[PDB]
Design a protein around this ligand. Structure first.
Ligand SMILES: Cc1cc2nc3c(=O)[nH]c(=O)nc-3n(C[C@H](O)[C@H](O)[C@H](O)COP(=O)(O)OP(=O)(O)OC[C@H]3O[C@@H](n4cnc5c(N)ncnc54)[C@H](O)[C@@H]3O)c2cc1C
Ligand SMILES: Cc1cc2nc3c(=O)[nH]c(=O)nc-3n(C[C@H](O)[C@H](O)[C@H](O)COP(=O)(O)OP(=O)(O)OC[C@H]3O[C@@H](n4cnc5c(N)ncnc54)[C@H](O)[C@@H]3O)c2cc1C
Lengths: 412, 413
């Protein structure tokens, strides 16, 4: 019994793992020359692990925690105590919106939990930003929320469905747990454990047909792969440019076209000494260096690791920037915090920007009017099942990518 | 003499006020802020050069604008558009276009858009221009080039914008090739100077509008009640949603106002001892913090050189929280990527004011996926309340459109 898995990111890898354990022959088809998709770890010469893709899970992410245990891996706690530079340096723990502004937000979150699907479709016509401004939240408070949500969405609240953001705020992601050896230890552990899996590299899927009890997937090279079932883990843009016979369901196609992938750019600097003056260092800014942090994984490392996460148009600013420019953006952020000292940079690692046709720059974001898109993207098409972070309950997370694989494999 | 209330003193409100005043109607002009002109503002530099911190250019064929400028005894100047691009490498003006295949696809789509019914336009409007053109076979590289080509108008990513709206805009896309002698604020000041029988109320935002018994009653934050036979709103979309209306706005108009996203356009001028460019008619695009940089000088035989910078999107917030030293460095790094890394001899700097965006938008109304019909809804009168401003116009998001919107509203009084 052969099952085709399309895409070798963590959802594809976890699907392949679960299938292979039940004695199914898996045909895993990957567009690029590497497995792991939006997960990528660089081992620095210091022994520190640099997560250029997904770096954190939440302590309560059950799928991830269960798989990490199953595979004999280990997690480390990552303390989140973030300063903010906005107008002035604001110490960690001191810059949230006012308790009364939070009460308005809690009321709207509970309202979205209580209303029916028709009411939710109506609320989804409006951006979270415009909806909160209409409900009397200040521009100042909305800017604070934009920092607080930035490491998840990677884009402005002006871009996002009010309904989706209020839905997400029931159980908002926290980035407080790392995998020992970096997040690519998890992807590699899955790869090391596949049995009876043929992997095709550097050969994107261009067409999918189903009929006569078979799924046939054709790649760019002209290779035809047949199976009893297929699990798509492909990003939304690829669902629309692959040729399907028969055609994707009308709502699934529209839903793939509504998805807007956010733009999350990561830079690590390897430094001679600590540029921060406190433990558990992290800080937000509106500058090109949006979020900087002590990223070190090797607790007794001489070299120090400064991580930078920049979202939105900052991705394109950084993709255009030289290494000296990235160092300066980071030094200016440290200077506004009262540091400024010329950083002693030994090495640099940044995001790869050349294969975004296959590997999204960020996570699926849900603009106004996209209500229902996850349900439509998840819906099976006979023996073609759909997974990926954009199909999950906890969408846009490693947890969600993994949970999506279980949901698809359980249908066969 | 009927009284007409004009809400907002940007160029649409000032032109409405001028038009009404010309026929002898008593106008009550209500402005939220301490200045008239709204998204138009000109700083006069000590060099004699005019710095347009707001709207800078009209198109040669913007007839509403050209006709009014002539009528107020003002003059225009030509602005040559020859824009370089830094994107991977320095690409000289005229050498950077989308692929011929992609240009053919875009030509056919812009043609298709004027030959499909309203059901088809509503369906196309569900998708972003970016995702639609990618689906239709345009490359990421082609879409990044269009993003530069359209940036001085929209001031935001094509990933934000209705496919339908952008295809509809491409039949007559705005070109920025004409400036006003003395800066754009010469026009707003000439309107202010030509008002007769106009009471101007400053620093007193409208908070409620009622209509009944053949009158419109407008109330301000201070509690002033102004009565009129008719009322022209030039207010931006967010203000329509927060003002209390009795009777209430039509559901489609309220939704339309809540769908509008205002782009974020930040402007800086450097006054320099020496030209940092090496050609005449200099301008250049990049993805850097300094998105569009240009020779902005207006004064002939100026010793002092004026470098203008327009930056959009998240660049607005980056710049709003930047020091003057950082702004200079963002501009020097943009010049360095074109081959001019020489230190700048900076005499003075002027930037965007960021503090009144509640009342004065940071950019132009943009129309995301799902916003099909918003302009028609925002324009629609409510008895003797008429709607104007750039977001109600055929050439929405321009000075021309703001001016045209005033004529359409005043004609109905
Ligand atoms: C920079 C960044 C930081 C992140 N940080 C975090 C974080 O800290 N924590 C968190 O929980 N989440 C984070 N996320 C989200 C998380 O990375 C993703 O949700 C998750 O890794 C996606 O897994 P996936 O299997 O759904 O997709 P992907 O990892 O994108 O895998 C899809 C695969 O399909 C392949 N493919 C595409 N098209 C084709 C085709 N035509 N044929 C064949 N193969 C194809 C691609 O090459 C890729 O390998 C981050 C995302 C990014 C980009
Ligand atoms: C930075 C920037 C650059 C631009 N560049 C160009 C360009 O080069 N060429 C071009 O053609 N267009 C350009 N535009 C667009 C152009 O500026 C606008 O289309 C036009 O000026 C808008 O005029 P308006 O009268 O519709 O609105 P505004 O100028 O915004 O006027 C609205 C007025 O209403 C007032 N107001 C708001 N709320 C209330 C209230 N509650 N009560 C009373 N008054 C209130 C405001 O304070 C303001 O004075 C640019 C815009 C910006 C922001």
């Amino acid at each position: 019994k052969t099952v085709i898995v399309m895409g070798g990111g963590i959802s594809g890898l976890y699907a392949s793992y679960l299938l292979s354990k039940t004695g199914i022959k898996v045909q895993l088809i990957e567009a690029t020359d590497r497995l792991g998709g939006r997960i990528r770890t660089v081992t620095d010469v210091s022994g520190n692990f640099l997560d250029l893709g997904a770096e954190w899970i939440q302590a309560e992410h059950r799928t991830a925690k269960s798989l990490i245990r199953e595979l004999g891996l280990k997690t480390t706690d990552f303390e989140v105590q973030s300063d903010l530079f906005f107008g002035s340096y604001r110490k960690f723990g001191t810059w949230d919106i006012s308790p009364k502004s939070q009460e308005i937000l809690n009321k709207l979150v509970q309202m979205n939990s209580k209303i029916n699907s028709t009411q939710q479709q109506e609320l989804d016509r409006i951006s979270f930003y415009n909806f909160l401004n209409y409900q009397g939240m200040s521009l100042e408070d909305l800017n604070i929320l934009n920092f607080k949500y930035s490491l998840y969405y990677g884009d402005s609240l002006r871009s996002l469905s009010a309904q989706k953001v209020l839905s997400d705020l029931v159980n908002f992601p926290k980035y407080n747990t790392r995998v020992e050896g970096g997040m690519e230890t998890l992807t590699r552990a899955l790869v090391s454990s596949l049995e009876n899996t043929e992997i095709i590299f550097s050969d994107p899927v261009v067409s999918v047909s189903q009929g006569e009890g078979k799924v046939i997937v054709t790649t760019v090279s002209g290779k035809k792969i047949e199976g009893n079932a297929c699990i798509s883990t492909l990003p939304a843009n690829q669902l629309t440019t692959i040729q399907w016979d028969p055609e994707l369901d009308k709502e699934k196609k529209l839903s793939a076209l509504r998805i807007r992938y956010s733009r999350i750019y990561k830079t690590f600097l390897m430094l001679r000494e600590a540029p921060w003056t406190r433990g558990s260092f992290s800080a937000y800014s509106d500058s090109v260096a949006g979020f900087i942090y002590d990223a070190g994984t090797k607790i007794n490392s001489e070299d120090k690791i400064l991580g930078m996460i920049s979202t939105g148009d900052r991705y394109d600013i950084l993709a255009s920037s030289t290494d000296a420019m990235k160092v300066e953006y980071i030094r200016l952020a440290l200077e506004s915090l009262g540091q400024g000292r010329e950083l002693q940079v030994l090495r640099i690692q940044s995001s790869e920007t050349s294969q975004s046709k296959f590997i999204p720059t960020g996570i699926a974001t849900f603009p106004p009017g996209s209500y229902g898109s996850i349900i439509s993207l998840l819906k099976p098409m006979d023996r073609i099942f759909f997974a990926g972070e954009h199909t999950a309950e906890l969408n846009g997370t490693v947890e969600g990518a993994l949970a999506s694989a279980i949901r698809a494999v359980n249908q066969v």
